[PDB]
Structures are given as structure tokens and as C-alpha cells.
Design a protein around this ligand. Structure first.
Ligand SMILES: Nc1ncnc2c1ncn2[C@@H]1O[C@H](COP(=O)(O)OP(=O)(O)OP(=O)(O)O)[C@@H](O)[C@H]1O
Ligand SMILES: Nc1ncnc2c1ncn2[C@@H]1O[C@H](COP(=O)(O)OP(=O)(O)OP(=O)(O)O)[C@@H](O)[C@H]1O
Ligand SMILES: Nc1ncnc2c1ncn2[C@H]1C[C@H](O)[C@@H](COP(=O)(O)OP(=O)(O)OP(=O)(O)O)O1
Ligand SMILES: Nc1ncnc2c1ncn2[C@H]1C[C@H](O)[C@@H](COP(=O)(O)OP(=O)(O)OP(=O)(O)O)O1
Ligand SMILES: *N[C@@]1(O)C[C@H](n2ccc(N)nc2=O)O[C@@H]1COP(=O)(O)OP(=O)(O)O
Ligand SMILES: [Mg+2]
Ligand SMILES: [Mg+2]
Lengths: 375, 744, 254, 353
């Protein structure tokens, strides 16, 4: 049975990441894996709110758009809103009752909070650019393409939650529920957990980035720059989320946490693959749905499909998977100006700056060293 | 082919023809190296559909060329530029060859695009001669960012229909002809030609108001407006009206609002009680954001207040993203004013006492005028138990200020004592109490009681810059400065003033700000860097030459055309030179002797005077440097191929002379820290009449804990104070966000 | 003064009610706002208001007029606003209330309106602004020299003017803004007060008044379409919207 | 069965607070209860990090303290660390699979994140005031005087989670698992959720404020100033969380959200009161354990017990419970310086005028 606080004094530097003793005391002075500590620190320093970006010009630029471009922008915003609404609640339910180290638990909670901020920001953009947002938010759960591009994540989450509840409630073995035989296997639970993590990786690493490219193409045409700043701030945290999922998957494949997980993942060099191929195909369908009434300068169906294949290859190489597409280059190199902020110098008196950290100061002041200072 | 059909500009429909696109690309590719037309065609043809407009084809090829700008093939920066030129000409005259200058001027004046006076002050023959001066081939020397800024910001255009009316050479020649319109007919055209050759060849950089409004019938080109707000409802209303009137006319605003009494302060002896400065700050912010800057960009303003203000803890956090609408004003920048006393309280670990400015008579005036009186009054009032005050820890206040400056990057510092002791103006008569939006302008101001009150004084500064990357010798600054000064001075007699107080200030002081651009390129060409301190002597010599030649030009202009009306209020009238009131600590880091005869200049200034109160001020040149493809101001470039982002585009800018000088450049995030840059800034401030837009840059990955230490921030602040740095501009931080998507 | 003293009837003080007396103490009778002690009674307040109002009257009929007005007011037959009762007979001369300010389609007019709003809210006076003449978003300025960013930024400026002297940012500032129904931005102005929008497109602390006439009502009745114009693009339509209905119909049809 | 994304486009403005259709999309432009949106906005407007507070002098101040004051400080820190280590994860696990309105879901997520920030701050303080933070963290679990409270607090969460799992797995009714009969009832699960929410309210309303008083009493002595600076922000966030859970309990009790939870609240009038008085007694016994081998200049057993009684009276009145102690003013005033339209139009208007 799951317990919020476990009365056994375990050593948390020797516990597995998942399927161990549930965490009791939240400590941050020592981590089994420091990568999650760094991710939490970076996410905290990356704090932001949509209210800090002036979006007055975004209304004017949106109302002057042709119908087809408005359709593209609003469809990407609606999909992102729904998926980040899902991503706000899903880690806390699927992953929290399975995590057995404090660092991963805190990272999952911080990641969920970041997704709530992202959903608020998408809603903020929609409220700003649309004079009646009720007509837009109501066409989200009923949109056919949005549903077709979203079930392949909630399904895996639901399966993981279902058999996690079964495991926490019955234990390993064969049991009889209402006369039906239910088998609870920790191997199957580990397999579902790996599959769900691989689905979340695919989502946050490919689908959200396709939507990001769609939103950034408008800013490349000197249109809707404040929404672009908001989306760039979102992508800044999305990089951290995909890095965290990638590390979670790679630590379960090398066997450094559980020797069984390595062979379980080896039994998934087709399933995990098939899932990524299906996600790429779903993105191709989404790209066809976006550019149905027309295309836009710098972005059409062919370019977005090429980018889908490129990013799928790039993010599948990072999790030890074969490349399902031709090894090519980036068809839209300008996206690199929206995800790498090292050489980006924005005009601060015209547009907002997206390169600020919150509370990244050591705060230690020694008055003795400052006293010996001649002004 | 694919049997595609395009929509022509005249509304007709034609068949696709790739040969025409290839011909245009080849036209734009003349004389370029490591540029392939095939790649542009490959990235452009995939986006062509049925019924595509030819204008969209041009935009597609321009964008495809611009996306190829990189360190391996920097020459694309020209191919994406000429293409963008090709489109502008077709958008301006319906063809490539521009018309005759006189016909263009007449046609533009008819429809009201240009000022009528151009057709009255110049005859047809003079227009033909200026047309002879013109060389449109110089349009091929622009970079992609330069052309994008010209198209989106500077070229005369309809802001509603998007139609462009002029090219860049017409812009330059008409600015030159319109500045020197009132000059004697014998030497007028020679001055016009010399100024046009200076600007078109990128020797002198002009700011946005001048580059976008000199030929226009709206005649206001002061880039910087300084307004002082008084502790009065009438003063607040007048400040709001002046802000609205001047933002709409191509001007940024620096509001000194440190005189407004604190929250809870009695009004009329107790009949009413003050509700705080926050609602008035919100009023100022809405005044700034109501209009645009002449239909070019959004308005911006900076608020100034002393550190010892009773509400300083509330004002410090006004910018961060961690509040609500009732306690945050996030769309205006802020400047904290500090003197030696606060720094000493921080050093000794004592407490800082905050008073309402209305409750301490004389403290606010002595804050800027003289510091002995300020210390006496501050000590007296700290021991007075009948005065409303609040005591805070100096380390706590400074920590809060630096926390907010790091988190928002836009909490600027002004050392008021340095702004007055090392000032061209006399603190007793004309003290400096504030700065401009970008913290480079330091001019006297007087509060206004009405938008038409004549007792007030609004400070106006018109700017220009020297391209240090276009001068081969410092002696070349002799002529250019003259031109610059002359042009700017003529602008002062050409401009219109919506607020009479601004006219009073501009005609009384005639202040100009001439800075520099391409300083990083200059250092790299001389084989020096910011960090190691090798540039100290070179910076000393360069800025000594700049200040000497600006002063000489102003002195000649004064002895030819009369001295400045309020020249008696400046320290120059008493023989005091910038080489006299500089901070002595600068002697420990620079050993370079003066090369020019400053004694003869001092005697000449005493005898005749200066036409202008101020001449030097280092602006950031965020937008104006892009025209000449120059590093902005004195800031090192962030990358070899940097990205300039604005509402007018995301643009890839290559550092000048990247092929032969990439190893000699020092990029911003390759700097050990801030010591060398601050030393260079202090050496500059030794000679500059006004402040310098000095940035502090911190990368938290350079420290063991991954966090910038508060000790380092305070040490850098104290170091900037020690070397005489008047003001600190943006604090830039390396967030470390990197999700690289390069080829596999 | 002796004649006024014999005109005074202090028995009328026993005609008030408890809420009446509480309001009288709170805002009517002169008092010290620190020590909280009062100095005058209701009858003195009424008689002195009557005397001060009729001070510049001929001395043949001044006393009878003062007596009649005091009898009318003390009997609760004529009621006058709280600022009159708190200011008249006192050294102040600010007898505030509500002010109607019209704003033209000019930057000078906008600045003057904002200054007047600031000067009148500090006296705790309600504001009625007519900002319906401001041209719509996208209208040319100086023949295309600038792009108009709409009425919303100026409405926000007016709102901050109203709240400039308000405690906590937004507390006792009250204003009502008027615009015609046929304004080109009417769809974006009607939703200025609901929470479905962001701060950048919402002005929630000011009330709004939509101006309608016969043509809008008859188009609603017939189920036709209402056409919205920028007031600067239709010469004479804004003036005819109030003055001449037949002329407005002719101009609207044209 | 719980689903992360429910495909039915329900109307979230009429859904119950709990036990309705699981939330699918988050709505910020409209809320059934705006109080949670205001709470989320306030929490985001109070965002802080432990690294913004200087705690350098705290080590020197702690090293100069007497043994019995050091004991009090470290026991208070251990109690706070355990409480917020529980409160970090517990709302995200117990409440998330039960919420059916987006605003409450977002508030719960933000609240859990803020509790994680509190835990990080406690770790920061412990690491900055003690030579090795192990002798405290590994002592938290085994400390006899804290584990009883740990069980008493986590039991409600665990029972709620277990019943929620059976409800989502089997649904309402009588089922057979491994030959034993399990009765899953929505009334029983509603009672469990109400009891858990009351336990959370008692935790963040009473248990944390005693420790706040102990931490602030050192501040009134000009000792451990950075710790006090951190605890001030923690107390602000606590007040926010307490307001949120108080609103949750009040809206469940009023019956305006669920016509069945009113009965459950009425039948908890004895169990909820017992839980609150048990929490108050536990805090009094913790105060006893704190000052055993000595006492502090401004804090002792007596006045701290009076403060516990005062704070629990005030926080028990707020959720409609009978006061269990005599009315008494705040014994430590210094702590107050540290804390619906149908849119249809016919063609009958043509014949109006
Ligand atoms: N028939 C065509 N097929 C393909 N591209 C064309 C064709 N005609 C013009 N273009 C391209 O369209 C771009 C823009 O051309 P341009 O600005 O001259 O407008 P236009 O439609 O050609 O009208 P016009 O030249 O008569 O003024 C050019 O780069 C040009 O190469
Ligand atoms: N001599 C030139 N050098 C550089 N660019 C040119 C030149 N002539 C035209 N251009 C540019 O190339 C584009 C098209 O030129 P042009 O109108 O002559 O041919 P086109 O429009 O492509 O085909 P068509 O002759 O059918 O109109 C325009 O943007 C135009 O400004
Ligand atoms: N009613 C008000 N509420 C809040 N602030 C006000 C009010 N009236 C004026 N202020 C502000 C405006 C100024 O910043 C400051 C000073 O008041 P002011 O405009 O000078 O009128 P005043 O001259 O009659 O009072 P004083 O003699 O005290 O200056 O107080
Ligand atoms: N720079 C600006 N940005 C946004 N709006 C502006 C700007 N300048 C003026 N406006 C608004 C204010 C008025 O509502 C409207 C007209 O302004 P106005 O002050 O009368 O200028 P104007 O007379 O020089 O040009 P016009 O004749 O077109 O009005 O446009
Ligand atoms: N006087 C100023 O400091 C402020 C003002 N300004 C600059 C940039 C923006 N977006 N708005 C403004 O109001 O101009 C000068 C600053 O000088 P520069 O920034 O260097 O001039 P320029 O690059 O715009 O041409
Ligand atoms: Mg006054
Ligand atoms: Mg006008």
C-alpha cells in the first residue's frame, strides 16, 4: 500500500528511482543523481509569468492576419493548451506514487508546476488575441484533429495509473476480482512505466517543438512578437523537461538503477520505436490539417513535415533508438535563434528580454572584505 | 515547373518562370564569395504554390538568403541585403533605377511626405547638383540588418498601407540638404556634399529621430527628453502632458519623480493624505504606452528616485515578475540615485535612513548640489525624532537593489555625486538631478507647473555617433566632428517644440550628445581586448582626441556664430575642463599622457566660449549601429553572428571584418568578469561630458556554486563608483538556455 | 445673528432618525478628524448654510429669505448634497459632485482631459468622459505618418488618471466613459469590463455608456446589419448622431 | 476508471468540486469559484527562493547558543521539515485524482510546488547552521517524538488514497477480491476526503504556527535573523494554503456545491472536532517536549500552550466548529509583526414599435 510517509529509515542514495520504498523525508543536501537537482535549480531560476510581456501589438497583428494564418496560430495554441493541461496533472498521478528518491519527486512536482504556468500562458495569449475566447476554448475537447493528436499520451498515462493502483492495492501475483483473473506483475508495470516515459519524451520533444516552430514562423515575418516571446519562454522550460525525461529514460536503460529494467527496455527496441514512428505520423497529419486553407511564407506542409522528420531523428538518437528517417539537416535553421539565447541580443527598449534568472544570487555578503575598500 | 501560376503585381496572372528568380539572385550575387544561388533556390522553390504573389516570392527569396547567414558564409549578409534593396526600389518607384532627385522631391512634397521648405530653400539647379552628388550604388554596401531597419523604421512610408516612398540615398541626401538649408548659399552645397559623403560612407551615424524625420514635415528630432516632476498635482499633470506630447514625436523620456512625497504624507497640513507614488507611476506608464514613437516603435521611459526615499523598498521591486497589478509597474525602467554617503554606510555596515523628500527641507537639493551640505543635513535629520523616517540595514537595501537588478536587468544606477563634480555644468546654478532613458544624458532640468509654464526647463538632447571602425587615424576626427557639430547645431534651429519649456532648455543650453560606435571592432583591429587591460591607453588616447576635437569644433562654431546663451552657467566658462575634474583613481590604471594642447583650447574657450554646453555622450546605438553594420556603442558583441531581435525583425548580424579579425574579437560571454570593462568605461568618462551607457554582464556558470555571488555584484558596483562611472545600464545574464538543433 | 437665534428651533433636532443622526455625525457636522470630537449641532448647520447661501442678498429681504430656507431645510422639505453641507459655512470652497468632460480627437485634447480628470478626482468628484470621438484602431495619423493604436490605450490612461489619487491603486475613483454604438471598435469596447481578457485589453475600473439612436433600434427590429465606422472617417456623421436624426440617416446611408 | 484526459466536453462551470468528471482542459477565463484563481495568482505573486536570504550569521549565532536552546531550534526545524516533506507530495496524490474543476486542480499543483520550495528552504537552513545535515535528516525519521505525529498525519492521506484507488478500480458497490468482500461507497469516500481536508487544515493552521512562534522568538532576541527571514515567507505561503483549504471545507460544508457533502459534514461534527482537539493536544505535548531541559527568554511551556489554544480556537471557529477552549487574547502579540443568460431572439420584434 502506498504511504505518504514511510516509517522505515532507508538510505536514499541506494534506492532505485522507481518502484522502491516511497520517499519519506525530502532532503536536498545529497542526491543519488545530481542531474535532477540541477534541473530543479534551473527550472526555479527560469521562473516567469505571461504578465511580464507586453502583448498590445499582438492583438493588432493577429486581427490583420488572413483567415488561414489565424487558423494555424489558434489551432497550435489550442493543442498546446490541452496538452499542457494534461501534462500539469499527469506526472503527479502517474509518477509520484512510484518515485522512491526525493530529487526525482521534487523534479516531477516542479515540472508539473511549470506546465501549469505554460497552460496559463497559452490561455493568456488566446485571451489577448481573441475578442471572445469562449468560442475558442470550447472547440478543444471536441476538435477531431486535436483528439487524434492527443490520445496517444493520455492512453499510456491511464494504463500506467491503472496498473500502479492495482500493484499498490493487491501486490504482485494472481488475484481474483469479481471472479475475473487479474495478474499484477512488476515486470509489466516497469514495461508500462518505460513506455509512458517514452511517450512523454516523444510529446515534449517533438510535438511541442513542431507547435513552437509554427508559432515562431509568425515572428520570423515581423508579426506577433510578444506571443513569440511567451512561446520562447515556454520552450526554455520545455528544453529542461525533455532533458529530464531523457535522463530518466537513459538511467533505466543502462541498468544503473535496476538490472531488470535494462533487459525490459531491450525487449522494447520495436515498441518504443513504433511509438515514435506513430507520433511522427500524427504530426504529419497535424501539419496537413494546419495548412489546408493555405500556407505561410517560411512554413508550409512540406517544410513542417521535413522538420518533423529531422527532429524525430534528433530526439530518437538521444534515447538510444534507430533513426527512422533520412539523416538530413535542419530545414528551418532559424529555429535555432529561438532555442539558443547565447548570441541573442534583443533591443530591450522595444521588446522584452527572455534571458533573466530569478534568485540565482549566492546572497552571501562579508562586510569585512567590503570595509577594506577605498572609494 | 509543376504548371504553377503566379499573381503579378498589376493583378494579372502569369506562368511560373524560375529563370527570372535566378536572374534576380545572380544580380544580388555579384562580387560575393562562398555564396551559392542553388541553396537559396532550393529553400525557396519548395514554398511556391499556385497563385503565389510575386511580392511573396521576393520575400521568400530574401528570407531564404537571410537564413543562410553564418560564420562559414558571412557574405550572405550582403546577398540578403541587396535582394531586400531590390524589393524596396520596386516598392518605391516601380523599377530599379531611382528617378531624378528634383522630380522625386516635388512628387513627395505634393502629397505631403516631405516638408515644403525643401522646395523653397533650394532651386532646381541646386537639386540637380545634389543629384550629381548622389551615388545609388552605395545602397549595395548595406548589410541585411541595415536594410531591414531602413525598411521597417527609417524610410518614409505609409504606416497604414505599408507603401514605401524613398530609398536610402535619397534619405541621406535630403537629411544633409535639410540640415544645412539655412547656411550661406556660397558654402551651403559644399557642406551638404561633405555631410552626405560622411553619412552614406558610414563615418557618422545618425539616431532614429534624425534618420526617420528630418525631411518629414514633423520637425522634432531630439532623441532624449528629460522632464523633472515636482511634488504637485499641476506638476504631475504637466509631466504627463509633456510625456504624451514627446513620446508621440520620436523621443524617449527620463522622468525624475523622486520629489513626490511618500505614502501617508500629509497634504495641505492634514486635509488629505498622500496615497503613494505608485498610482502616479502607473499614470506615467500609461502616458508612455498610449502613443508610439512617431509611428516607429513603442515608447519607453525611465523613472529616477533617490535611494533614501521612504518608499524605496516598494519602488525597487516595481519591475519584477513576482507581484500583482496593484504593486507593479513593469513596463517602465527605473534608476536608483546613490551618492558617497550610501556607499560608506554599506562599507561600514551601518544603517541607511529613509525620509520623505517633503519632510526634509534642503536634503533633496543638497543630494545633487554639494555633498558636505547633504552630509550635514542627513546627520541632523537622522537625530531629529519629530521627522517621519525609517531605518534599514545598508547591506539589506543594497542586496534588495542588486537582487532586483539581476532578476529584471533594468534597475539602473546613477552616482549623483559623480554626475555633478565631473560635470560641464555648475551644481550651484544648474545641477544635474536625473538622466535619460538609456542613462547616457546628464542635463539640468527644472520642474514644470503647467505644460505651457515658462519657468520650467525640459532638457533636450540630439545625438550622433562617430564610427570608430571607419576612421584610419584619429586626426580624421577633426573634420567629421565639425560636420557633426554643425549639423546638430543647425538641427537645433530647425526643430519645433511642442512644450515651451523644452524650447527654453534647448535654446539656452544647445546640448548635443556625440558618442561612438564600432568600439569593439576598433579594439579588435588594434589587437586589444576588454579584459586584460591592454586597451586602457588606447581608449585614453582615442577619447582624448574625440573630446578635444568636439570642443574645438564647438569653440569655432561659437566664435563664428556667437556663444551659447547659458554658457555662463557651465564650468567651461570658468576655464574648467574635463581633464581637470576627473576622478584621481583613474591615474592608477591609465598612464597615457595628453597629446593635444588643452591649454590653448582652454584659453580659446575662455575668450569666445562653446556654442554647445555638452558635446559627448556614449549612447548604446542599439538600432543606429545596425545601419553601418557596427558593434553597438562600446559593447562587445555577443557572438560572431549575433541575433538582433525587435518588432521590425529578427536579424542575423556578422561582426565587421569577420574573415580577418575573428580571432581578435572578445565576445561578451568570454570575458573573465567586469573589471576591465569598468576600467575602460571610467577612462572614457574621464573625457566624456555626459554619462556612458555602461553594462554589467554576469554568467553564473563561471562561479563554483553556479550562482553569481552578491559579494561580486557589490564589489563591481563599488569598483564602478571608484573609477568615476556615473551610471550603470542593463545587467545582462547568461541564462544558459540551449537546445541546439543542428544537422545530424 | 440675534434674529437668526430667535429663528432657530432646536426642537427639530428630535425629528431625525438613528441612521440620519449617524450620517450627520459621520459626514455633516464639523468636527476634528484627529480627536474625533464634534463642534456643532444640526440646527446650527442648517441655519448657517442658509445664512452663507443668502449672504450676498439685499438687507431688506435677506433675513426673511434665510428664515424661509432654514425652515424648508430643517423640516426636510429641500435636500442638498453632502458636499454642500460639509463645505458651506466652512472656509473651503470646493463643493464637488460630478463633472462632464468631453475629449476631442487630438493629443492636446487627450492631455487636457487627463489633466482635468486628475484635478477633479483629487476633489473626490465623479467623472463623465465622452471619448467616443477618438478615431478607431488602424486609422491613419497625419495621412499615414503613424498607425493609430486604438482607443484602449487612451482609455487606460484615463483610468490611471481616475485612480491617480486612489489609495491602494484602485479605490474611490469613479468614472463613466461614453462612446457611440456604431464605433468601429465597439465590439472590443463592450467587453472592456469582463474578466475573459488579459490586462492589456481590459479596462475594468471604469464604467461605460453606449450611445444609441433610432437607426440602431430599427435595424435591430428589422434584423438588418449595423455598419461601424471610425468617427474620423465619416465627415459630419458624429455631429449628426446627436443633432439631426434625418441628416444622420442620410449620411449613414451614403 | 480515472482518465487523465476525459473526452467528454462537459460544462466545468456546473461540475462539483470533487467526484465529478475528471478535468480535461484548464480554464482561466472563467471559474466556478474565483477564490482558487485569486489564490493561484497570490501564490505566483509570492514566489521566492531560499537562496535570496543571507543566513551567514545564522551559523555563528547557533554555535553560540546554549545546549537547550540549540535543542529547541533543531527540534522545531525537524518538525517543520517533516510536516512540509509530507505536505509536498500528499495533496498531489490524495486530491488530484478526485478534483473535477480546473481551478482547484491548478491550485493544488501550485500549493504542492510551494511546499516543495518550503522543504528546500528547510534543507538550506539545516545545511547552513549544522556541520553535517545527516545527524538531523536521518534523526527525523527515527525520532520517537515526531514519528507519532507523522503517522497520525499521514494516516488520513493513506486511507483517502486507498479508498480512491478502490473507487477508481472497482466502482461503487460490493465486490470480491481474493475471497474477501470489499464495499466501495461514494459516501464513505466523501467522508474520507472531508476528514483528510480537515486534517490538512489543522496541519497548516495550527501545527505550523507553533513552530513559527518558536522560530520567531529567536528573531525577537536578534538571533538567527536569516532563519526568521525565511520563516516569514514560509508563513505567508502557509496563510495562503490555509485560506485555500478553509474555503474548500466551507464550500463543501455549505452544500452549495454538493447536496450530499452537507450531510457528511454534519456527521463529522464529532469526528472533525476530535481531530482538531487531538492536533491541539499533540502541539501542546510537542511544546512540553521542546522546553524540558530548560526554557527560553521569551518562550516557555505556559505561554506557548496559551498560544496553541488561542490559534486553534480562532482556526476552529473559521470552519464552523465549537470552540474547545476559553476565549483569550493573543499571549504573544509580537508574532503579529512577523505573520445564467439564455441567448435566443425571435421575430416578434418586427411587430414591436
Ligand atoms: N513570371 C514570374 N515567374 C516567377 N517569378 C517571377 C515572375 N515574375 C516576377 N517574378 C518574381 O517576382 C519577384 C518580384 O517581382 P516584382 O517586384 O518585379 O513584381 P512583378 O509581379 O514582376 O510586377 P512588375 O515587374 O511588372 O512590376 C521578382 O524576384 C521576380 O523575379
Ligand atoms: N537591373 C537590376 N538590378 C538589380 N535588381 C533589379 C534590376 N532590375 C530589376 N531588379 C529587381 O528585380 C525585380 C524584378 O525586376 P523586373 O521587374 O525588371 O523583372 P520581373 O518582374 O522579375 O519580370 P517581368 O519583366 O515580367 O516583370 C524587382 O524587385 C526589381 O526591383
Ligand atoms: N487628493 C489627493 N490624494 C492623493 N494625493 C494627492 C491629492 N492631492 C494632491 N495629491 C498629491 C499631488 C502631489 O504629488 C502632492 C502634493 O499636493 P499638491 O498638488 O501640491 O496640492 P497642495 O499644494 O494644495 O498641497 P501641499 O501644500 O501640501 O503641497 O500630493
Ligand atoms: N504617435 C501617436 N501614436 C498613437 N496615436 C497617436 C499618436 N499621435 C496622435 N495619436 C492619436 C491622438 C488622436 O486621437 C489622434 C489624432 O492626433 P493629433 O494629435 O490630433 O495629430 P495630428 O493633427 O498631427 O494628425 P491628424 O490631423 O491626423 O490628427 O491620433
Ligand atoms: N535618449 C535615448 O537614450 C532613449 C531613446 N530610445 C532608444 C531606443 C528605443 N527603443 N526607444 C527610445 O526612446 O533614444 C536614446 C538612446 O539612443 P540610441 O538607442 O542609441 O538611438 P537608436 O539606436 O534608436 O537609433
Ligand atoms: Mg503643493
Ligand atoms: Mg489632429
Amino acid at each position: 500500500a502506498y504511504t505518504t510517509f514511510s516509517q522505515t529509515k532507508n538510505d536514499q542514495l541506494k534506492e532505485p528511482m522507481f518502484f522502491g520504498q516511497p520517499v519519506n523525508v525530502a532532503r536536498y543536501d545529497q542526491q543519488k543523481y545530481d542531474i535532477f537537482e540541477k534541473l530543479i535549480e534551473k527550472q526555479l531560476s527560469f521562473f516567469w509569468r505571461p504578465e511580464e510581456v507586453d502583448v498590445s501589438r499582438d492583438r493588432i497583428d493577429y486581427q490583420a492576419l488572413p483567415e488561414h494564418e489565424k487558423h494555424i496560430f489558434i489551432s497550435n495554441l489550442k493543442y498546446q493548451t490541452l496538452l499542457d493541461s494534461i501534462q500539469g496533472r499527469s506526472p503527479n498521478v502517474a509518477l509520484l506514487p512510484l518515485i522512491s528518491i526525493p530529487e526525482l519527486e521534487t523534479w516531477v512536482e516542479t515540472w508539473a508546476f511549470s506546465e501549469t504556468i505554460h497552460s496559463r500562458s497559452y490561455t493568456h495569449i488566446i485571451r489577448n488575441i481573441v475578442n471572445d475566447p469562449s468560442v475558442v476554448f470550447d472547440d478543444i475537447v471536441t476538435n477531431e484533429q486535436i483528439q487524434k493528436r492527443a490520445e496517444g499520451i493520455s492512453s499510456y498515462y491511464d494504463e500506467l495509473i491503472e496498473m500502479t493502483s492495482y500493484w499498490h492495492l493487491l501486490g504482485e501475483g494472481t488475484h481474483t476480482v469479481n471472479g475475473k483473473t487479474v495478474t499484477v506483475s512488476l515486470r509489466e508495470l516497469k514495461k508500462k512505466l518505460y513506455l509512458c516515459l517514452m511517450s512523454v519524451n516523444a510529446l515534449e520533444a517533438i510535438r511541442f517543438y513542431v507547435s513552437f516552430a509554427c508559432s515562431f514562423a509568425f515572428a520570423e515575418r515581423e508579426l506577433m512578437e510578444g506571443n513569440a516571446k511567451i512561446i520562447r519562454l515556454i520552450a526554455r522550460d520545455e528544453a529542461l523537461h525533455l532533458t529530464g525525461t531523457q535522463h530518466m529514460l537513459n538511467l533505466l536503460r543502462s541498468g544503473a538503477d535496476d538490472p531488470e529494467m535494462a533487459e525490459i527496455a531491450e525487449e522494447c527496441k520495436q515498441e518504443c520505436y513504433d511509438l515514435f514512428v506513430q507520433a511522427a505520423q500524427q504530426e504529419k497529419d497535424w501539419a496537413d490539417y494546419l495548412f489546408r486553407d493555405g500556407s505561410m511564407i517560411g512554413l508550409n506542409k512540406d517544410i513542417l513535415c521535413q522538420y518533423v522528420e529531422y527532429i524525430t531523428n534528433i530526439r530518437m538518437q538521444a534515447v538510444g533508438l534507430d533513426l527512422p528517417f533520412q539523416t538530413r539537416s535542419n530545414p528551418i535553421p532559424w529555429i535555432n535563434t529561438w532555442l539558443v539565447s547565447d548570441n541573442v541580443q534583443v533591443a530591450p527598449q522595444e521588446v522584452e528580454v527572455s534571458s533573466y534568472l530569478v534568485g540565482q544570487i549566492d546572497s552571501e555578503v562579508d562586510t569585512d572584505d567590503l570595509s577594506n575598500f577605498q572609494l | 515547373n509543376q504548371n504553377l501560376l503566379v499573381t503579378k503585381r498589376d493583378g494579372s496572372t502569369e506562368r511560373i518562370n524560375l529563370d527570372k528568380i535566378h536572374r534576380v539572385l545572380d544580380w544580388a550575387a555579384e562580387g560575393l564569395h562562398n555564396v551559392s544561388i542553388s541553396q537559396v533556390e532550393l529553400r525557396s522553390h519548395i514554398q511556391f504554390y499556385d497563385g503565389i504573389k510575386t511580392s511573396d516570392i521576393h520575400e521568400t527569396i530574401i528570407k531564404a538568403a537571410a537564413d543562410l547567414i553564418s560564420r562559414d558564409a558571412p557574405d550572405y549578409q550582403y546577398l540578403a541585403a541587396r535582394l531586400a534593396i531590390f524589393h524596396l526600389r520596386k516598392k518605391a518607384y516601380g523599377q530599379f533605377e531611382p528617378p531624378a532627385l528634383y522630380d522625386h522631391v516635388v512628387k513627395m512634397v505634393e502629397m505631403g511626405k516631405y516638408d515644403n521648405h525643401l522646395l523653397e530653400d533650394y532651386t532646381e539647379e541646386e537639386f540637380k547638383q545634389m543629384d550629381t552628388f548622389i551615388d545609388h550604388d552605395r545602397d549595395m554596401t548595406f548589410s541585411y540588418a541595415a536594410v531591414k531597419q531602413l525598411e521597417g523604421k527609417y524610410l518614409v512610408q505609409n504606416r497604414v498601407t505599408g507603401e514605401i516612398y524613398e530609398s536610402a540615398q535619397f534619405l541621406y541626401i535630403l537629411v544633409a540638404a535639410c540640415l544645412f538649408s539655412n547656411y550661406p548659399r556660397e558654402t551651403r552645397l559644399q557642406y551638404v556634399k561633405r555631410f552626405y559623403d560622411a553619412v552614406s560612407t558610414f563615418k557618422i551615424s545618425l539616431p532614429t529621430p534624425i534618420m526617420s524625420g528630418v525631411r518629414t514635415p514633423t520637425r522634432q528630432f531630439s532623441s532624449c527628453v528629460l522632464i523633472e516632476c515636482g511634488d504637485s498635482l499641476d506638476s504631475i499633470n504637466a509631466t504627463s502632458s509633456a510625456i504624451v506630447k514627446y513620446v508621440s514625436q520620436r523621443a524617449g523620456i527620463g522622468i525624475n519623480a523622486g520629489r513626490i512625497r511618500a505614502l501617508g504624507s500629509p497634504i495641505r497640513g492634514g486635509e488629505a493624505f498622500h496615497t503613494g507614488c505608485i498610482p502616479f507611476y502607473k499614470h506615467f506608464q500609461t502616458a508612455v504606452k498610449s502613443c508610439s514613437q512617431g509611428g516607429v516603435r513603442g515608447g519607453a521611459a525611465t523613472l529616477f528616485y533617490p535611494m533614501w526615499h521612504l518608499e524605496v523598498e516598494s519602488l525597487l521591486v516595481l519591475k519584477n515578475n513576482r507581484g500583482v497589478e496593484g504593486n507593479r509597474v513593469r513596463h517602465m525602467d527605473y534608476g536608483v540615485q546613490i551618492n558617497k554617503l550610501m556607499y560608506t554606510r554599506l562599507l561600514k555596515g551601518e544603517d541607511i535612513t529613509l525620509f520623505s523628500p517633503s519632510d526634509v527641507p534642503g536634503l533633496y537639493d543638497a543630494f545633487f548640489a554639494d555633498q558636505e551640505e547633504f552630509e550635514r543635513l542627513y546627520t541632523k535629520y537622522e537625530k531629529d525624532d519629530s521627522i517621519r523616517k525609517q531605518r534599514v540595514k545598508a547591506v539589506e537595501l543594497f542586496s534588495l537593489m542588486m537582487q532586483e537588478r539581476a532578476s529584471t536587468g533594468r534597475i539602473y544606477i546613477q552616482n549623483v555625486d559623480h554626475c555633478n563634480t565631473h560635470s560641464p555644468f555648475d551644481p550651484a546654478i544648474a545641477p544635474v538631478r536625473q538622466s535619460n532613458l538609456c542613462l547616457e544624458i546628464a542635463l539640468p532640468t527644472k520642474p514644470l507647473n503647467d505644460v505651457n509654464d515658462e519657468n520650467g526647463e525640459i532638457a533636450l538632447c540630439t545625438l550622433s555617433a562617430f564610427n570608430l571602425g571607419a576612421i584610419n587615424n584619429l586626426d580624421e576626427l577633426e573634420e567629421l566632428a565639425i560636420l557633426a557639430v554643425r549639423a546638430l547645431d543647425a538641427l537645433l534651429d530647425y526643430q519645433d517644440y511642442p512644450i515651451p519649456a523644452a524650447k527654453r532648455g534647448a535654446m539656452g543650453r544647445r546640448t548635443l550628445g556625440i558618442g561612438v560606435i564600432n568600439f569593439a571592432y576598433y579594439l579588435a583591429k588594434h589587437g586589444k581586448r576588454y579584459s586584460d587591460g591592454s586597451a586602457n591607453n588606447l581608449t585614453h588616447k582615442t577619447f582624448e582626441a574625440i573630446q578635444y576635437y568636439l570642443l574645438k569644433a564647438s569653440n569655432e562654431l561659437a566664435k563664428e556664430q556667437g556663444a551659447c546663451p547659458w554658457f555662463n552657467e557651465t564650468t567651461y566658462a570658468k576655464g574648467i575642463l574635463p581633464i581637470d575634474t576627473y576622478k584621481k583613481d583613474l591615474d592608477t590604471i591609465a598612464n597615457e599622457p595628453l597629446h593635444y594642447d588643452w591649454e590653448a583650447l582652454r584659453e580659446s574657450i575662455k575668450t569666445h566660449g562653446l556654442r554647445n554646453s555638452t558635446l559627448s555622450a556614449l549612447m548604446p546605438s542599439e538600432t543606429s549601429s545596425q545601419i553601418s553594420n557596427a558593434t553597438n556603442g562600446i559593447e562587445p558583441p555577443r557572438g560572431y553572428v549575433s541575433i538582433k531581435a525587435s518588432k521590425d525583425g529578427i536579424l542575423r548580424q556578422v561582426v565587421p571584418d569577420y574573415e580577418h579579425l575573428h580571432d581578435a574579437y572578445e565576445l561578451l560571454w568570454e570575458m573573465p568578469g567586469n573589471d576591465g570593462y569598468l576600467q575602460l568605461v571610467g577612462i572614457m568618462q574621464k573625457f566624456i561630458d555626459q554619462s556612458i551607457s555602461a553594462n554589467t554582464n554576469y554568467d553564473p556558470s563561471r562561479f563554483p556554486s553556479g550562482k553569481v555571488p552578491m559579494q561580486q555584484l557589490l564589489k563591481d558596483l563599488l569598483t564602478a563608483y571608484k573609477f568615476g562611472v556615473k551610471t550603470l545600464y542593463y545587467q545582462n545574464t547568461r541564462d544558459g538556455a540551449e537546445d541546439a538543433q543542428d544537422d545530424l
